[PDB]
Amino acid sequence: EKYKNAEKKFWHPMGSSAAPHRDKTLVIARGDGNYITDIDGQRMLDGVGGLWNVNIGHNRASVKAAIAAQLDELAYYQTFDGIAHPRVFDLAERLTGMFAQERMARVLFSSGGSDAVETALKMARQYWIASGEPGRTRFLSLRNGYHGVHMGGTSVGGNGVYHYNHGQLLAGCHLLDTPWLYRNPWDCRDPQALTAHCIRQLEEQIALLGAQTIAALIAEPVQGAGGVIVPPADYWPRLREVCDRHGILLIADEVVTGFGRSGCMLGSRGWGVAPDILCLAKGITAGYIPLGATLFNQRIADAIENGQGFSHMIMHGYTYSGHPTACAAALAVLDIVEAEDLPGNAAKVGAQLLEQLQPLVERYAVVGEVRGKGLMIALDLVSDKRTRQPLDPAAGQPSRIADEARRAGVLVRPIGNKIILSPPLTLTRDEAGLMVSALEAAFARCG
Amino acid sequence: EKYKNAEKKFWHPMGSSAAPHRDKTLVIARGDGNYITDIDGQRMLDGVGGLWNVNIGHNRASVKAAIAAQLDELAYYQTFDGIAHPRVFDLAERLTGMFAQERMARVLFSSGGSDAVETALKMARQYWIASGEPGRTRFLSLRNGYHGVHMGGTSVGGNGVYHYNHGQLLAGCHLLDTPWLYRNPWDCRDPQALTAHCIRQLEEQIALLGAQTIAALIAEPVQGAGGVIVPPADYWPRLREVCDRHGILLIADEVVTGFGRSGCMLGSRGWGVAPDILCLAKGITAGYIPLGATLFNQRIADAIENGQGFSHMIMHGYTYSGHPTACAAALAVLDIVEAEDLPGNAAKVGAQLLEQLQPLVERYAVVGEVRGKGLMIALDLVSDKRTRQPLDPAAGQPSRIADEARRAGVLVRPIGNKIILSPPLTLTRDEAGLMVSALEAAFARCG
Amino acid sequence: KNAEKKFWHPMGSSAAPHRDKTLVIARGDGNYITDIDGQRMLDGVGGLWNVNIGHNRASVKAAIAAQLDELAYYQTFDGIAHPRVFDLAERLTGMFAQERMARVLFSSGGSDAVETALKMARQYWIASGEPGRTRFLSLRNGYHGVHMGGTSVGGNGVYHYNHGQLLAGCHLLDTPWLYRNPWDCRDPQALTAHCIRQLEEQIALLGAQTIAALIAEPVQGAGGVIVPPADYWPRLREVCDRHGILLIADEVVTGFGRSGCMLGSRGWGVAPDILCLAKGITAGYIPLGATLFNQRIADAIENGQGFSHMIMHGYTYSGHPTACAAALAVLDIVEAEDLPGNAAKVGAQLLEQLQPLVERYAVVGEVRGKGLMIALDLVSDKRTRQPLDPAAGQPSRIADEARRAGVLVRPIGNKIILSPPLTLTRDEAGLMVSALEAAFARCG
Amino acid sequence: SYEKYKNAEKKFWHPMGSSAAPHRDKTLVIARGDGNYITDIDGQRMLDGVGGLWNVNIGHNRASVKAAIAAQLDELAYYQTFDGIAHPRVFDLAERLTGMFAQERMARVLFSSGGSDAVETALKMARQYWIASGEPGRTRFLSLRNGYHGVHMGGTSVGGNGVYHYNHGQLLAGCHLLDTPWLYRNPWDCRDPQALTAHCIRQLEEQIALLGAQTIAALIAEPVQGAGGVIVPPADYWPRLREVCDRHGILLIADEVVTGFGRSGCMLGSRGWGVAPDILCLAKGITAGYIPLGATLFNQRIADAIENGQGFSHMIMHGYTYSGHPTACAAALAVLDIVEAEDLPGNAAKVGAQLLEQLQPLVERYAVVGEVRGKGLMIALDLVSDKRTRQPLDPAAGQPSRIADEARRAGVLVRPIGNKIILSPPLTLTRDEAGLMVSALEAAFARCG
Ligand SMILES: *Cc1c(COP(=O)(O)O)cnc(C)c1O
Ligand SMILES: *Cc1c(COP(=O)(O)O)cnc(C)c1O
Ligand SMILES: *Cc1c(COP(=O)(O)O)cnc(C)c1O
Ligand SMILES: *Cc1c(COP(=O)(O)O)cnc(C)c1O
C-alpha cells in the first residue's frame, strides 16, 4: 500500500545497508500454515520456516488462544529474587520433564537464542567459581559455528563475516576445526578418520591451554547458519568423551535443532549424547512470542546452589525472563510438537527431500553437494568441484537462484554460497515435492 | 496449587539460589491496572511496575486487541537481508518521527534492554570502522550504571555484584564516577561543582586513553538499578559537549527513562541533550511483548551506509528483530503514552510522591535520603548518615522492610541498600498516598 | 657525525629534522660527562636515574674484570647455577631480611623486573588455589617499564598511544600528588584519605577475589617526582592486606638510596610482598635487574600443587655472572659510603636551595623532591597549575640553557627532572641550582 | 676453592624448573669456562654441549672480548640513548648491523638487553608501524605452535608451548597459533616437506580469511624453532611464509635470537631460506653472552612509515635504560669481528652436518631415540617410548634428565627440554668435540636408554 516505495527506517540484519541494494524489499504481509503472502498477493511456501523457527506452521488457533488467555490473566510480571508466577513454574516443570533423560534440573529463561547462549557462557563460569575452580574460564567452539550476536556469542562464533565490523571481543575463546567432510584442513573424506583428526586436535588444544583453564565447549549438533554441517555419527559421542576426560562442560547449542528439526527432540540426544547445558529458542515458541531457555543439569544446579558466599548469587537474568505470555505460548507449542510427532515427521519428510534433491548435484555444475538431516538442508554452491571454491555471494548468483525459486512459489534463504532449506516441521510429502520443483526451475534458469 | 510447595525448577534472576532462601516465593497470578494479585488472592499496588516497565498498567484492552489482530495476520516473520513485513515499517517510522528532534534515522530492533545496549556497543564499533577509524574501540560508562547482563552490557556495568561470578569480560571498558550528590569521591555537595569535578575526571581519562581509541560513552539520564541517581541539571549538557569535543559517540541508555518515567519522553531530552544512539525497551511495549530498540542518528546512518568494502554490511541482529506482534503492541502502547500524557503525569504525581516521602528521612535513622525524578524514586538506607554507609542487603533489612510494605498492600523492590519505587506512570494521587502509608507502616515496624 | 642515524632514540620524536641532532657523550668520570667535542657538563640526570655511584669507579671495573677471567657467563636454568648468583642472591635477601625477602629471580633491567613481578604474581595465586586473581592496580603517572605488561599498568598516556590494546584487567587509581589531584587537596593526610577511599571503591567494584596485585613506586620518578604523603604507603599496605592483594614495590629508581633509604618502601615503614630492582643495583655498569619475593610468595609456589611449582619464567641472562660481580662491588660502595644518607642530606640541601626559584620565576610552579630525585613543575598559570605544553618547547629551551651553563637536566612533559649520582657533593648541588637560575633567567 | 657452594641454601630460583623440594636441592654449580669446556666446583670438566643457552657462540674466555669490555668501561661504561642523546658505540654497532643486513634492507635498530626484549620491541613497534600508517585496526599477531619468543607478557602471549602459559593466566588477546611444519609430529602425519608446507600454508590462509587481514599486524616465527625442539621447517616453508604475508600486507618478524649470526649455517636463518623479513629479533650470540644485549631491526618500509607518522605516531615512546649500552656494544663489535673472521656460520654448517650424520645410528640402535634432526649446530634427539606410536617420553617421569645426567658424567653437558635432548654448542666446535658429543650420548643411551 505504502511499503513498496517509502524510505526504509530500519536495518535488515545480515545484509548490506548500502544503496541501492537497501531499497529492495520482499514485504511479507500474512502467514497461514506453511504458506506466506507478500503485499502484492504473491503466495509462496515458507521454505525457510521464518528463520528456522516457525516449526508448527503459521497461525495455529490453539497457540493464539493460549496467548489471548494469558493476556487476560497476566501478560507480564517479573521473576526476579523471590517473585514468580504460574506460567514460569509450568514451563520449567515441562522442560525439565521433557529433558529428564539429560538430567536437566534448572532453567534460566530469556527471549532468544543469543540470550540463551550468553546465559550458558556466563553461568558456566559461575559454575566453576561456585565449585572452587575460578581458573576454569576459557571457551572452546567450532569453526563455522553460529551462536548468536551478543558479544559473548559472537566471540565464540566460527564465521568471520560476523566478526569483521566489531573489533576485539572476548579473550580466551579458541576455535577448533569442524568435522566437515566436504571442506576440512586434512582433505579427509572418511567420517571416522575425520572424527579422529578433530578429536586429536581438540586434545592438543586442551593440552596446550591446560584443562584447568577451560570452562566449557559449545557446539551445535548440526551446524545451521554455518552451512548445515552434519557431523560424523561418532563425533558427538567423542566430544562428550573428551569433555568428561577433562571436566569441561559440554554446551549443546540446540537453538535450531531443539524440538525436532533434525529428527529428534534434541540433536545431541539424536547422537546419543547428554550435554551439561542446553541452549533453546526459535522453535520453543515457534516464533509466536520471543522466548529462549538455558537448562542446566543436576551437576551444575547442585554446585551453584551449594556455592559458598557470593557464588550462589545468580546476578544474571532479563526483565522478560519467564515472560508469562511467552511461557503460555511455549506450553501450547510443545503440546503440538509432541502430539503430532514433528521430530518423526522431520526425520521422514526430511529424508525424502534430501534424496529427491540429489539429482541437482548431477545436473548442475554449481551444486557442489546437498547435505542435511531432518528438515535442515543446504545446497553448497561452488564455482568448481575440485577445490570446492564457494561462489561469492557479492556476485549475486545465490540470490538470483533464490529469486527464481520464489517466482516458482517457494521462498528459500541464501546464506553466503549456500541455499538453506528449513521449512516448518509440519511439511508434507506433497509440499516437499513442490520445493524440489521450484528449485529445479531455479537452477534451470539461473544455475 | 502446587506452586507453594513443589521444587522450583527455574532460577530467580538477581537472587540467592541457596536453600532455604530460594524455597520462598511470592507467586503473582493476575494483574490489572496498577494492582497485582498473588495466588492467595492478596492484592497489592504494583509499586515496582513489574520491573520499571508496566508503564500503562496491566490488562489494557486496546493493547491485547492489537496483539490478537496481528497474530491473526502474521504472528512472526523475519526481517533479515531484503525481507520485512508491514509492522516493522510502521514502528520504525513512528519512532524516528517521535525522535526527529534527536535526528534519529535508523532502528535496529531486538527483544530487550540488554539487547539494545549490546546492539549499541557493537554498532558503535562498526560506525568507526566504516568511518576509517578502527582504532576507536574503548567504551566509557559511569559507576553505578546498569546496562543489562549480556557480556557487553555487563562489561560496562558500574556495580560489582553483576561482575563477581563471571570472570574477565570485554577489555577496554573504563568507568567514571557518577555525579551523585549523596555519595561521591569529592564529598562535594554542590551540583555545579560536582559536575565540574566529573567533567574534569572525564577529560583526564580521555587524555590518558587518547580520544582516538574511544568509541562511545554510555549513560542513563537517571541511573535506575544503581539507585535512582539524579544527576545535576548541567551534567548531561556538559557530558554531551565533552564527547563532541573528542568525537566520542554518546549512547543514552533510555531503557528505563524512555517514554516518560522521569517526566519527559526521553531523559536526555529532559536535560536538553541529543545523543547519537538511543537504547529503548521496557516501557516501549509496557511489558506486554518483549521488545527492544536501538536508534542511530543520521551521522551514524550515513557513515555506515556509505562505508567502504565490508563496513556497510550489518552482520548483527536477532531472529525476533522487528517481531510483528511486538511491534503491533508497541504501536498501541505508544498511542496511550502520548494520548494520556504519561510523561506529564509522571512529572506531577512523582514530584508529589517525592515530597510526601521526605518525612521518612526525619523520622527514621536508617533513611539517609529520598531522591527521585518523575516516578522513579529511591529510599537510600544507611547505617550512618555522616559517612552514608549503606546497609548490607545480604543482612536482609531492606528485604524485611519491603516484606512489611507488601503486607500493608504495596509491593516495592529492594536493590542493594535502596528501596526502589517505580510504579506505572498512570499512578494517581490517591495511589501515591497509599504507597506513603504502607512505607510508613514498614519503617515503623522494621526501620 | 653528519651521517644517517641508524638507531632510534627512546622517548623521542623519530621524525626529521629533529632526529638529525645528537648530543654524543664520549666519556664519563665521577659526576661529569663529556661529548665528542669536549663539551662538559654535570650529569644532573645520572644517566637515567642509574649511575648512582658516579662514572668510572676503579673497584667496580676490577670486579668485572675478575669475573670475566673466571666465568663471563653461564646459565642458571633448571638445576644449573654458578658462584656469583649464589653470592648476590644471599647478599640481597640479607640486605632485605627486614622485609622477609626469600627468593630472587634475576633479569637485565627494570622492565624485566616489573614483567617478572606481574607474571609471578599471577603464578602465586594459581599456586595458592585462587586463579581468579588476575587484575592489576597501579597509579596514574606511574612508570613501570615498556614491556607489554609494564606498559599496560603505566599511568602516563604517552607510552600507550602508539601500541594499541595491551593487557586487560589493568585499572588505574589517582596518584597522591599534592600539586595536581582531583580533590585539589594540598594537605598530606587529607589527600591520603581521598586516595584510600577511591582505592576501596575500585576494589569493591572489581571484587578482591579478581585482583592479583597493586604496583606502585615509593616515589614516582618519570611521572614527575611525585612524593606521596608520609602516611600513604602505610595505608596502601593496609588496604591491600585488607583484601589479600599483593603489593609490588617498583623500587627500580628508589632502591639503594636515591630517596634517602636503601628502599623507598622501607623509608615509609612498609614491607611489600614483591620488590622490583634495577638501575642502581649495578649503577649502570652492566645491565641487571632483580625481582625479590617474600616468604609468603616463595613458600606458596614451592609448595604448589600440580604444575604450579614449575617456574617457567626467566631469561638467558638471569643471574649473569659478570653483572652479579658488578652488583656486589656496587652495593659494597652504597653501604660503605652510606649513599642513602648522602642522598638524604644533600637532597634536602638541594631542594631547599631551589625554593627561591618559585618566588623568582612565574613559570616555576613548585619544586618537589625526596633525597636526590627532584622535579621543577613548570606552569603557565599558578592558580590552576596549568602545565606548560612541552610541544611548544619551553621546557626543552630551559633544559638547553641549563646545559650551556654546565648541567644536563631532563625535561619530561612540563617538568625538569633532577636525578644525579648519589655521590653528589654540596658544591655540585649548588652548581645545579646555579645552572637552573641561569636557564630560567633567559628562557623562563 | 668453591667448597662453600656445595649444600648451601639457594636463595634464587632456577628458570624453567621445579621449585619444589627435594628437586630444588640439587645443583650443578659451574665455576669456570674456557673455550668450549666448563668446569664445575668439584673440578669435573665437560664439553659445553648447550653453549651456555644457545649463546656462547665464540667460546668462553676470549681475551679480545674481555679487553674490549675493559676498554669501554675505562672510557664510558654507560650512558643513555634517549631523545637526542647517544654515544659513539651505539653509532658503531647500528652501522655495523645495518651493514651486515643490507641484503634485508634493514634501516633502523632499537637495542635492548636480551631476546625477550627484542621480541617485545618487535611486537610493540609492529603495532606502532600500523598506527603511524593510518591502520590502527591492524593489531592481531600470528605465531606457530612450539614457537618460543621469550617470557615477557607479549612474547609469552605468542608462545606455542603450554608449559610457559599454565601458571600465568590470560595474557594478550588477539594472538592466534598455527600448527608448525614439523615433519616428525604434525596434524597431517605428513613426512613430505612440500606437502607439509602446502598443508600449513592453507591453514594460514584460512586463519587470515577468518580474522580479516586488515586486523592482523604481524606474524612471528623462528627460522629454526629452538626451545620447541629444533624443528627444521621444510625448505620452501619460509619462502611461502613471506608470500602469504605479502599477500596480506602482514609484517614478517623473524625471531633470530638463536639463528642470528650463524648457528644454522647462515648469518641469518631467514637468509638461509632465501627470505627477507620485515623485522629481525636478535640477542644471545650477538655478544656471545659476555654482556646482555638484544637488538630489533626494522627495514626501510617500517622506518619510513614511523618517521613520517602524523600527529603523535612518530614519537617512539618505547625503549630501555640500557638500550645501546656502550659496554655491551663494545663487546658485540669484538664478538662479531670473530664471527666473520673465523667464518663461524660456515663452521656451524660443516661441523653441524658431520655431527648430525654421526648421530643417525642412534635412531637404529636405541628404541627411545625417535629421530635426530638439526641444521647447523642446533640438533635435537626426539625421545619416544617406542617408534611405533611415537609417543613422546614424559619429562616428569625423569628419563630425559637421567639420560642427560649420564651424558654429563661421560663429559658432555646437554639440555633436556621436554622429551628432547638439545645440542647447541659453541659455533667454534671442532670435529673432535663433535665426536665427543656422539660418544657421550652413546654412553648415555647405553646406560639409561
Ligand atoms: C539463530 C541462532 C542463534 C541466535 O538466536 P537469536 O534468537 O536470533 O538471537 C543462536 N544459536 C544458533 C545455533 C542459532 O541458529
Ligand atoms: C533493565 C535495564 C536494562 C536491561 O533490560 P532487559 O530487558 O532486562 O535486558 C538495560 N539498561 C537499563 C538502564 C535497564 O534499567
Ligand atoms: C626506569 C624504570 C623502569 C624501567 O627500567 P628499564 O631498565 O629502563 O627497563 C621501571 N620502573 C621504574 C619506576 C623506572 O624508573
Ligand atoms: C632464548 C630465546 C628468546 C629469549 O631470550 P632471552 O635473552 O632469554 O630473553 C626469545 N626467542 C627465542 C627464539 C629464543 O631462543
PDB file of C-alpha atoms in Angstrom, chain C residues 319-427:
ATOM      1  CA  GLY C 319      71.917 -14.293  37.146  1.00  0.00           C
ATOM      2  CA  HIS C 320      74.605 -13.164  34.685  1.00  0.00           C
ATOM      3  CA  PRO C 321      77.934 -13.820  36.469  1.00  0.00           C
ATOM      4  CA  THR C 322      79.565 -10.581  35.343  1.00  0.00           C
ATOM      5  CA  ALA C 323      76.501  -8.471  36.155  1.00  0.00           C
ATOM      6  CA  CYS C 324      76.339 -10.107  39.584  1.00  0.00           C
ATOM      7  CA  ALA C 325      80.020  -9.397  40.276  1.00  0.00           C
ATOM      8  CA  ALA C 326      79.434  -5.767  39.298  1.00  0.00           C
ATOM      9  CA  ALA C 327      76.408  -5.530  41.605  1.00  0.00           C
ATOM     10  CA  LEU C 328      78.348  -6.949  44.561  1.00  0.00           C
ATOM     11  CA  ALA C 329      81.019  -4.277  44.098  1.00  0.00           C
ATOM     12  CA  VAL C 330      78.414  -1.527  43.582  1.00  0.00           C
ATOM     13  CA  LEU C 331      76.441  -2.497  46.677  1.00  0.00           C
ATOM     14  CA  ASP C 332      79.662  -2.522  48.693  1.00  0.00           C
ATOM     15  CA  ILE C 333      80.066   1.153  47.760  1.00  0.00           C
ATOM     16  CA  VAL C 334      76.431   2.020  48.519  1.00  0.00           C
ATOM     17  CA  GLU C 335      76.813   0.704  52.063  1.00  0.00           C
ATOM     18  CA  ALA C 336      80.447   1.709  52.602  1.00  0.00           C
ATOM     19  CA  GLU C 337      79.841   5.349  51.650  1.00  0.00           C
ATOM     20  CA  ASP C 338      76.312   5.481  53.126  1.00  0.00           C
ATOM     21  CA  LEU C 339      74.952   6.893  49.883  1.00  0.00           C
ATOM     22  CA  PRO C 340      71.336   6.714  51.105  1.00  0.00           C
ATOM     23  CA  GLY C 341      72.364   9.080  53.887  1.00  0.00           C
ATOM     24  CA  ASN C 342      74.218  11.347  51.468  1.00  0.00           C
ATOM     25  CA  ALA C 343      71.192  11.458  49.153  1.00  0.00           C
ATOM     26  CA  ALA C 344      69.020  12.395  52.134  1.00  0.00           C
ATOM     27  CA  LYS C 345      71.322  15.153  53.381  1.00  0.00           C
ATOM     28  CA  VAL C 346      72.414  16.667  50.072  1.00  0.00           C
ATOM     29  CA  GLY C 347      68.988  16.132  48.525  1.00  0.00           C
ATOM     30  CA  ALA C 348      67.403  18.150  51.315  1.00  0.00           C
ATOM     31  CA  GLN C 349      70.015  20.880  50.796  1.00  0.00           C
ATOM     32  CA  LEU C 350      69.426  20.975  47.041  1.00  0.00           C
ATOM     33  CA  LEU C 351      65.637  21.012  47.497  1.00  0.00           C
ATOM     34  CA  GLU C 352      65.741  23.907  49.964  1.00  0.00           C
ATOM     35  CA  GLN C 353      68.167  25.897  47.786  1.00  0.00           C
ATOM     36  CA  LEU C 354      65.812  25.606  44.788  1.00  0.00           C
ATOM     37  CA  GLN C 355      62.764  27.025  46.584  1.00  0.00           C
ATOM     38  CA  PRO C 356      63.672  30.679  45.775  1.00  0.00           C
ATOM     39  CA  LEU C 357      63.069  29.846  42.100  1.00  0.00           C
ATOM     40  CA  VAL C 358      59.347  29.514  42.824  1.00  0.00           C
ATOM     41  CA  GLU C 359      59.322  33.119  44.051  1.00  0.00           C
ATOM     42  CA  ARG C 360      61.701  34.401  41.379  1.00  0.00           C
ATOM     43  CA  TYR C 361      60.078  32.945  38.236  1.00  0.00           C
ATOM     44  CA  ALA C 362      56.401  32.822  37.298  1.00  0.00           C
ATOM     45  CA  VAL C 363      56.896  29.686  35.210  1.00  0.00           C
ATOM     46  CA  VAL C 364      58.209  27.644  38.179  1.00  0.00           C
ATOM     47  CA  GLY C 365      55.035  26.338  39.808  1.00  0.00           C
ATOM     48  CA  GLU C 366      56.751  24.313  42.533  1.00  0.00           C
ATOM     49  CA  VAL C 367      59.885  22.354  43.358  1.00  0.00           C
ATOM     50  CA  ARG C 368      59.379  18.955  44.997  1.00  0.00           C
ATOM     51  CA  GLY C 369      61.632  16.041  45.822  1.00  0.00           C
ATOM     52  CA  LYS C 370      62.880  13.482  48.304  1.00  0.00           C
ATOM     53  CA  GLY C 371      66.542  12.623  48.529  1.00  0.00           C
ATOM     54  CA  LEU C 372      68.188  13.183  45.149  1.00  0.00           C
ATOM     55  CA  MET C 373      65.103  12.957  42.964  1.00  0.00           C
ATOM     56  CA  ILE C 374      63.657  16.426  42.370  1.00  0.00           C
ATOM     57  CA  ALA C 375      61.240  17.970  39.867  1.00  0.00           C
ATOM     58  CA  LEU C 376      60.546  21.561  38.867  1.00  0.00           C
ATOM     59  CA  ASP C 377      56.897  21.718  37.779  1.00  0.00           C
ATOM     60  CA  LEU C 378      56.585  24.391  35.077  1.00  0.00           C
ATOM     61  CA  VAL C 379      53.238  26.139  34.614  1.00  0.00           C
ATOM     62  CA  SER C 380      51.572  28.869  32.590  1.00  0.00           C
ATOM     63  CA  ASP C 381      49.116  29.660  35.420  1.00  0.00           C
ATOM     64  CA  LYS C 382      49.840  29.092  39.105  1.00  0.00           C
ATOM     65  CA  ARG C 383      46.191  29.457  40.164  1.00  0.00           C
ATOM     66  CA  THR C 384      45.177  26.399  38.129  1.00  0.00           C
ATOM     67  CA  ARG C 385      48.693  24.929  37.836  1.00  0.00           C
ATOM     68  CA  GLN C 386      48.205  24.784  34.077  1.00  0.00           C
ATOM     69  CA  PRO C 387      51.262  22.866  32.818  1.00  0.00           C
ATOM     70  CA  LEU C 388      53.306  24.316  30.014  1.00  0.00           C
ATOM     71  CA  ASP C 389      52.763  22.301  26.864  1.00  0.00           C
ATOM     72  CA  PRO C 390      56.053  20.532  26.014  1.00  0.00           C
ATOM     73  CA  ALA C 391      55.224  20.621  22.297  1.00  0.00           C
ATOM     74  CA  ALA C 392      55.629  24.406  22.462  1.00  0.00           C
ATOM     75  CA  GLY C 393      59.211  23.712  23.541  1.00  0.00           C
ATOM     76  CA  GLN C 394      59.795  25.950  26.557  1.00  0.00           C
ATOM     77  CA  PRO C 395      60.834  23.052  28.832  1.00  0.00           C
ATOM     78  CA  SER C 396      63.376  21.973  26.225  1.00  0.00           C
ATOM     79  CA  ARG C 397      64.682  25.523  25.788  1.00  0.00           C
ATOM     80  CA  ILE C 398      65.140  25.799  29.554  1.00  0.00           C
ATOM     81  CA  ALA C 399      66.940  22.444  29.539  1.00  0.00           C
ATOM     82  CA  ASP C 400      69.192  23.545  26.673  1.00  0.00           C
ATOM     83  CA  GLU C 401      70.226  26.682  28.536  1.00  0.00           C
ATOM     84  CA  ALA C 402      70.951  24.617  31.649  1.00  0.00           C
ATOM     85  CA  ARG C 403      73.286  22.513  29.503  1.00  0.00           C
ATOM     86  CA  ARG C 404      75.122  25.625  28.297  1.00  0.00           C
ATOM     87  CA  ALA C 405      75.530  26.558  31.969  1.00  0.00           C
ATOM     88  CA  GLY C 406      77.176  23.176  32.572  1.00  0.00           C
ATOM     89  CA  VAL C 407      74.415  20.870  33.871  1.00  0.00           C
ATOM     90  CA  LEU C 408      72.418  18.295  31.919  1.00  0.00           C
ATOM     91  CA  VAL C 409      68.796  18.014  33.087  1.00  0.00           C
ATOM     92  CA  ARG C 410      65.857  16.099  31.629  1.00  0.00           C
ATOM     93  CA  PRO C 411      62.575  17.716  30.505  1.00  0.00           C
ATOM     94  CA  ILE C 412      59.668  15.271  30.819  1.00  0.00           C
ATOM     95  CA  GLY C 413      56.431  16.896  29.762  1.00  0.00           C
ATOM     96  CA  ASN C 414      56.213  20.175  31.671  1.00  0.00           C
ATOM     97  CA  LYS C 415      58.752  19.105  34.333  1.00  0.00           C
ATOM     98  CA  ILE C 416      62.521  19.440  34.690  1.00  0.00           C
ATOM     99  CA  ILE C 417      63.798  16.297  36.420  1.00  0.00           C
ATOM    100  CA  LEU C 418      66.931  16.163  38.575  1.00  0.00           C
ATOM    101  CA  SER C 419      68.323  12.716  39.403  1.00  0.00           C
ATOM    102  CA  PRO C 420      72.119  12.971  39.748  1.00  0.00           C
ATOM    103  CA  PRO C 421      74.544  10.412  41.193  1.00  0.00           C
ATOM    104  CA  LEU C 422      74.111   9.820  44.907  1.00  0.00           C
ATOM    105  CA  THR C 423      77.759  10.840  45.474  1.00  0.00           C
ATOM    106  CA  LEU C 424      76.674  14.429  44.796  1.00  0.00           C
ATOM    107  CA  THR C 425      78.524  16.960  46.943  1.00  0.00           C
ATOM    108  CA  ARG C 426      77.269  20.261  48.303  1.00  0.00           C
ATOM    109  CA  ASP C 427      79.245  22.105  45.606  1.00  0.00           C
TER     110      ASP C 427
END
